[PDB]
Design a binder for these strands. Structure first.
Length: 863
DNA sequence: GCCGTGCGCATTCGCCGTGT
DNA sequence: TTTACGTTGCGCACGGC
RNA sequence: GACACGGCGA
């Protein structure tokens, strides 16, 4: 059959008159009404895309995949698996010849059969009308075969799968491709003969229908999901069931709004929910984006006045569309040949259709999927600024993720990519003045990518290009030099402001938002908390006449070691017995440091080889991780570019390099590395399930991790292991299932997830608190009211940048000067469960010699 | 008690969309 | 209804002469 | 507390 969805009544969201007078008088009916029209639209747009997506999935037999099918699919699956099992019993206890189907349904697991039956037939019915029990049965029988055949090369003697065939499967997409690919793997698993040598004996269409038939029957027997329409004959979906998916899908499409900016200041936050938008719609905003309610309730009665003042001041910043920039963006994006790098192609590419051509395809392919993806987004951010082009000002509601970071709620907001940032500017401008001008030029220098050199040099760079800049402002569609800069629209956006000053002088009212970005917040904060004077200089926390480059500092240290090895290290080998590689059974050319240190130097190791690795350090990236980055980022790309033969055995080459980067960075920034290991031990111990080694009883259960940021924001890290069992099918994807063991309730913490998350999560929560403090500081001590916020990037209008430049450094300083985050963290969990004698807990790492006051005179820290 | 096998894991969080 | 190159060790867990 | 594939922000 077909699922009939119906639209929702969003008119309800059109707030009452008493709450409406809250807006009117405040902002006036025109807007007050417009806003509510806007919020109502958000919900309609959301419903629009759900219905669309749905209809798409339906016309592809993927109904079972939709979140509307799930609630029902999960009620049936058990009833089916049970019937299948019961059946297998009757058929056994009954003397004589067993049904022709029994034998085949024995290959795959019962639960697999049940899902493939629910799913496959669930499609056939909603797709076409060939809902004939003979056609459906063949569909089921065919799917059951392929799962059985290509399933063994996974469940049966086949780990080679989770190695040489698992990841390569996730690449191919579509029931069709994955099959044409397994037929392939299958054929070559013979040259080696994994499953021994039992070549899958085809099934023969006859039986492949006795099976499909049995299943249908079992399905009908266990649950009236489908009904056999009396008549060759056909089947159709049970009404109560069809009307069910329609109901879930209806509700689902009303809690999926496509949030937009506000036309009036957003609604102040006074609680954990309800702030931001004014209507009291279906999806009320939550101050915090917690996973699974309950956590959001923890914030219910927490006293954190400063956190509130911040989220409010922040979303109270008025913005407007940048028309001049919108003017060029609208058109230059319709060009066949755009001067701006990687700004989609209105039209799709093509490939040269005549080892060789293999890539001539894989290339254009990848390249297009990615482009079609950027296009969808660009067009939306575009066909949306045009909608707010004329408004006097717009606003964006804010809330935070669970660590405290502040995210704007609307889909189109100031924290997007370059084209989005360029289209937006601040509404409340002010006469630029002598300094706003100074900073404006620096903002412009940074937009051109010239940011790795001192301030006078950045000013010179801009002064030097006066005429280029003047030209781009006069005729952006003609000159286009701005389009070749690192952030073209933001740069262009600065060109129009820079020209304004020329034409009008310093009394000129400017509102362009000048960004002050920190360099590696993670490392800046660890170094700052541990007083690391060496890692702190590397990230500009200390005054210098030169701008420090942590990546350059690391690459440099790599060559220091690259020399010491090229002529003073290991030599080749041919593999021995249980040496360093645990215990392999053969022998190759295990290259030695001197061999490796040779190829790298014979390559030219610069900052770009280390860039990637230092960036992800704060996300827990270690030596193994680097092996992946260097290989993918540096080698492969160079090997494929044909211009790199230093490497013969690249995997060995990367292990070494990855080892070197780890070493040096491990001495460059110790506070970071050190504070990270500490954080991980603490997490490791609280998540541990302590059982007495004697009685085997649990003395202390696994624990979650909690802490409060310096501005009073509490954070609870409690990753949890999957509730239900995850079963993955070869082609028909995965599906959950209730726990086989009743004595498996609770919830269960995920100790591994607690360890790999704590360090980055802790640091992020610190960055956030820093941002929040900075905002409140700036607003109270200096009176600034407009803020562009991107986690570790703070911005204002030129006339206000000197005071933000100040504020951002005074808060970093005041905060770390007023409290020890690590020792504070300890004092939180030490007592409150952790007991027994788990005291293998390392001592807080030692503080260094960094004098935080210096950060005040530091010019390149920004944050 | 203390290792040969054996195996689980590699980078965090927030978001949006899906050629035939 | 045809593109998907690339595969290495270190740790925390059982049982066991 | 969600497949995979692609894109973006820190």
């Amino acid at each position: 059959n077909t699922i009939n969805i119906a639209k929702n009544d969003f008119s309800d969201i059109e707030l009452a008159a008493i709450p409406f007078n809250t807006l009117a008088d405040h902002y006036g009916e025109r807007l007050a009404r417009e806003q509510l029209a806007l919020e109502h639209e958000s919900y309609e747009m959301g419903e629009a895309r759900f219905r669309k997506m749905f209809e798409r999935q339906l016309k592809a037999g993927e109904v079972a995949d939709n979140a509307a099918a799930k609630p029902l699919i999960t009620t049936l699956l058990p009833k089916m698996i049970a019937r299948i099992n019961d059946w297998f019993e009757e058929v056994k206890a009954k003397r004589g010849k067993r049904p022709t189907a029994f034998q085949f349904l024995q290959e795959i697991k019962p639960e697999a059969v049940a899902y493939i039956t629910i799913k496959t037939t669930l499609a056939c019915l909603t797709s076409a009308d060939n809902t004939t029990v003979q056609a459906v049965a063949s569909a089921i029988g065919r799917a059951i075969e392929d799962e059985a055949r290509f399933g063994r090369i996974r469940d049966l003697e086949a780990k080679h799968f989770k190695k040489n065939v698992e990841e390569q499967l996730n690449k191919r997409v579509g029931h069709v491709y994955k099959k044409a690919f397994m037929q392939v793997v299958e054929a070559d698993m013979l040259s080696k003969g994994l499953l021994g040598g039992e070549a899958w004996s085809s099934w023969h269409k006859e039986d492949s229908i006795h099976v499909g038939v049995r299943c249908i029957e079992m399905l009908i027997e266990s649950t009236g999901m489908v009904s056999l329409h009396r008549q060759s004959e056909t089947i159709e979906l049970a009404p109560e069931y069809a009307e069910a998916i329609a109901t879930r899908a209806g509700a689902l499409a009303g809690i999926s709004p496509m949030f937009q900016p506000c036309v009036v200041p957003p609604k102040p936050w006074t609680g954990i929910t309800g702030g931001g938008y004014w209507a009291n719609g279906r999806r009320p905003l939550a101050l915090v984006r917690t996973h699974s309610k309950k956590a959001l309730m923890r914030y219910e009665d927490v006293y954190m006045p400063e956190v509130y003042k911040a989220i409010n001041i922040a979303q109270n910043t008025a913005w407007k569309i940048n028309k001049k920039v919108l003017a060029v963006a609208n058109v230059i994006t319709k060009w066949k040949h755009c001067p701006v790098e990687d700004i989609p192609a209105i039209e799709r590419e093509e490939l040269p259709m005549k080892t060789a051509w293999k890539r001539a395809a894989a290339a254009v392919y990848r390249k297009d999927k990615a482009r079609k993806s950027r296009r969808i987004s660009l067009e939306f951010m575009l066909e949306q600024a045009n909608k707010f082009a004329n408004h006097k000002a717009i606003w964006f509601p804010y809330n935070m993720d669970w660590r405290g970071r502040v995210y704007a709620v609307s889909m189109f907001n100031p924290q997007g990519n370059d084209m989005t940032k360029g289209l937006l500017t601040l509404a409340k401008g002010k006469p630029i003045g002598k300094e706003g001008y100074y900073w404006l030029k620096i903002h412009g220098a940074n937009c051109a990518g010239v940011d790795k050199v001192p301030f006078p040099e950045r000013i010179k760079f801009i002064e030097e290009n006066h005429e280029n800049i003047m030209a781009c402002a006069k005729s952006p569609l003609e000159n286009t030099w701005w389009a070749e800069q690192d952030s073209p629209f933001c740069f262009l956006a600065f060109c129009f402001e820079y020209a304004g000053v020329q034409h009008h002088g310093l009394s000129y009212n400017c509102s362009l938002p000048l960004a002050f970005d920190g360099s590696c917040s993670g490392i800046q904060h660890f170094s700052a908390m541990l007083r690391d004077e060496v890692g702190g200089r590397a990230v500009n926390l200390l005054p210098s006449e030169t701008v420090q480059d942590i990546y350059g500092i690391v690459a440099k240290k790599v060559n220091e070691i690259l020399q010491a090895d090229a002529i003073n290290g290991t030599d080749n080998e041919v593999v021995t017995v249980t040496d360093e590689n645990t215990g392999e059974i053969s022998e190759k050319v295990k290259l030695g440091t001197k061999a490796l240190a040779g190829q790298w130097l014979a390559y030219g190791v610069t900052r770009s080889v280390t860039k990637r690795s230092v960036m992800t350090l704060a996300y827990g990236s270690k030596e193994f991780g680097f092996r992946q980055q260097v290989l993918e980022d540096t080698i492969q790309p160079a090997i494929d570019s044909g211009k790199g033969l230093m490497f013969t055995q690249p995997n060995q080459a990367a292990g070494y390099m990855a080892k070197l980067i780890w070493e040096s960075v491990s001495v460059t920034v110790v506070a970071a590395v050190e504070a990270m290991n500490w954080l991980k031990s603490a997490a490791k111990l609280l998540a541990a399930e302590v059982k007495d080694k004697k009685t085997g009883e649990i003395l202390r259960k696994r624990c979650a991790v909690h802490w409060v940021t310096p501005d009073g924001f509490p954070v609870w890290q409690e990753y949890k292991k999957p509730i239900q069992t995850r079963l993955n099918l070869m082609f028909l994807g995965q599906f959950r299932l209730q726990p086989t063991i009743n004595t498996n309730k609770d919830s269960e913490i995920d100790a591994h997830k607690q360890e790999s998350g704590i360090a980055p999560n802790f640091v992020h929560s610190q960055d956030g608190s820093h941002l929040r403090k900075t905002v409140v500081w700036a607003h109270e001590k200096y009176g600034i009211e407009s803020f562009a916020l991107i986690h570790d990037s703070f911005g204002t209008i030129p006339a206000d940048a000197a005071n933000l430049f100040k504020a951002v450094r005074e808060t970093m300083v005041d905060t770390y000067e007023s409290c020890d985050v690590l020792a504070d963290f300890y004092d939180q969990f030490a007592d409150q469960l952790h007991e027994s004698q788990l005291d293998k807990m390392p001592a807080l790492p030692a503080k260094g010699n960094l004098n935080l006051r210096d950060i005040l005179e530091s010019d390149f820290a920004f944050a």
